Amino acid sequence: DTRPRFLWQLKFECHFFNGTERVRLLERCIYNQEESVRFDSDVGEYRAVTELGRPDAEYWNSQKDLLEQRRAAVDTYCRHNYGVGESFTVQRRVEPKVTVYPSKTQPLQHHNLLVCSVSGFYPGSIEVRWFRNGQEEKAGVVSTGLIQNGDWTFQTLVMLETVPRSGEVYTCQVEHPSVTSPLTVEWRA
Amino acid sequence: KEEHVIIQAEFYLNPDQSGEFMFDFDGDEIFHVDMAKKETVWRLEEFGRFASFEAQGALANIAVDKANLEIMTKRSNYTPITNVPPEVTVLTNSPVELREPNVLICFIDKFTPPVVNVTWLRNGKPVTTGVSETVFLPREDHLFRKFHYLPFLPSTEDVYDCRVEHWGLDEPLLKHWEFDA
């Protein structure tokens, strides 16, 4: 099956700033991978993104009732849906599971990557810090970044470049809106 | 400055005649509409207990989208989409421990059109027990992402592959994962 494909996408994006204080509705039409026309509530009418979209942006701008319904959508549609979904989306909180382990089983005095695995948390806002014997270590941090698991959980791996000597104690400190006190996990050399 | 984004994302694709309607919150799917059974499928169970959704409207929107795809196909001088092959990654949701149940995640990312064949392989053989998948999820660049899931028992004796077929790949892509001591 090699026959050509043709794709049409329609996206309505409700952007929320400082709760529902500022709302922006962005309606976007996309042919294949090219956005052709959009309605931005800050402008209040359709605009052709590419010339392919000019016939639609003109036609739709001639419909006054359509423009009115779209202009009011920030209230009847965006703010409504934000309210419907607030309790279990904006306010979803799942606490992260934290583990610390050496990436490699290497004896002391040799370079090692210490891994802080933070899994299963929501929302995605999170802060991970490394401490060597109580001192924060800002250098040599290597991170996968934020990983969205697709099932309303996140994970992240934050690694520290170390040369572990005997007696040293490394601690990973995680701050997340789901916890009132930062979570801490130790690994002793 | 942004705090949150809700996206009502729709698409229709020819000549596959495949349509999709979904709601997205900060990148995660709230629900989609099963086109065949004509009904709301909630990404998480509890969602359907806190909220509801009338599918009829989503199907009406899909019909308009099909009409518009045909109009735009003609208008563009029958310009086809350029295939964009997916990036595939395989991770565990949690650190692997022998005998402790876990889940492999196959991330299929940054691809278009939204048609893929995804199979899980254990020691080379297809596995379908307990597997699941998400529908296609929108991206800001208007490509798509997808997730496949495999619950499993970690062991030193098994290897795993996520096998992804997509028209942008001239060859099936295998992404490998194994527990290595």
Binding site: E27, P55, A73, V84 | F23, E54, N61, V64, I71
Partner: peptide
Amino acid sequence: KSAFYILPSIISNEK
């Protein structure tokens, strides 16, 4: 159990 609302899609300039 409140209900999510949709925006309707609109036909394009056929002409």
